[PDB]
């Protein structure tokens, strides 16, 4: 069962602090896959499977990959002398939300509502499975352009969800909450809701609101595009400086701006096709 004989390796897609990711086909059935390599030397956090010392990333992916959801599923993985190799689903055709927003600019509220809703369902899925992503942002979201389905990627900075304080963080600083900038401490859910506030602003305004620490801890939110009062309200709530003032997932999805969401299929027909 070698990696080279069960999958046909294609060319690079991307690389960074996650690893190096290639296009691939499962020869078994010509399924499009993504093949992600991570050097053991470069891995910070390690975990155990139900039994085997693997990267945390593999632990989290196994926990969320049960049944269908808005998360890219781990299909297989392999250990090697100096690395691990993850086999993941690859939608075709696909674009990441970061390139999609660059290309189209600020999204219409109807589209932002469908995208944001699907991200909320994928994050809830993660939390229900005991997984905290810790790097929610447009770059870590794939759009299946035919199905109108968003998929969460790159759990490489994630952790088991706990109700106690987190004192480490490896995610994107400009999506990190003020309490991390100021005190090097955060709780999972409330940090996640902050990052989702950044993401919603990104979607409706065409870029993130904050670049510098001073702006993050200032919690002054200037809207650089026309945004409805209801959407401005949900964003300012998610971006409350005090963690305990942020909405719960339930309060976000019950928010008036979040009602009458499009179905994924509607979203593809109206906005992507």
């Amino acid at each position: 069962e070698p990696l080279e004989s069960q999958y046909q390796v294609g060319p690079l897609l991307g690389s960074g602090g996650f690893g190096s990711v290639y296009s691939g086909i499962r020869v078994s059935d010509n399924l499009p896959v993504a093949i992600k390599h991570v050097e053991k030397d470069r891995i910070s956090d390690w975990g155990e499977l139900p039994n085997t010392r693997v990267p945390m990333e593999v632990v989290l992916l196994k926990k969320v990959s049960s049944g269908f959801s808005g998360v890219i599923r781990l299909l297989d993985w392999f250990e090697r002398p100096d690395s691990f190799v993850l086999i993941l689903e690859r939608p075709e055709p696909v674009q990441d939300l970061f390139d999609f927003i660059t290309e189209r600019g600020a999204l219409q509220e109807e589209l932002a509502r469908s995208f944001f809703w699907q991200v909320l369902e994928a994050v809830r899925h993660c939390h229900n499975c005991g997984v905290l992503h810790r790097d929610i942002k447009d770059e870590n979201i794939l759009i299946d352009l035919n199905r109108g389905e968003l998929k969460l990627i790159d759990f490489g900075s994630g952790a088991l969800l706990k109700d106690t304080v987190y004192t480490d963080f490896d995610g994107t600083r400009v999506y990190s909450p003020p309490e991390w900038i100021r005190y090097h401490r955060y709780h999972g859910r409330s940090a996640a809701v902050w990052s989702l506030g950044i993401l919603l602003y990104d979607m409706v305004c065409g870029d993130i609101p904050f670049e510098h620490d001073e702006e993050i801890i200032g919690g002054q939110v200037f809207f650089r595009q026309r945004v409805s009062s209801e959407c401005q309200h949900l964003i300012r709530w998610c971006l409350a400086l005090r963690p305990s003032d942020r909405p719960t997932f339930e309060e976000i999805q019950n928010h008036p701006w979040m009602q009458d969401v499009l179905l994924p299929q509607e979203t593809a027909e109206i906005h992507l096709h």
Binding site: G16, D135, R173, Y175
Partner: peptide
């Protein structure tokens, strides 16, 4: 302000 990616 150019929009840009941000490393983890």
């Amino acid at each position: 302000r150019k929009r840009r990616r941000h490393p983890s």
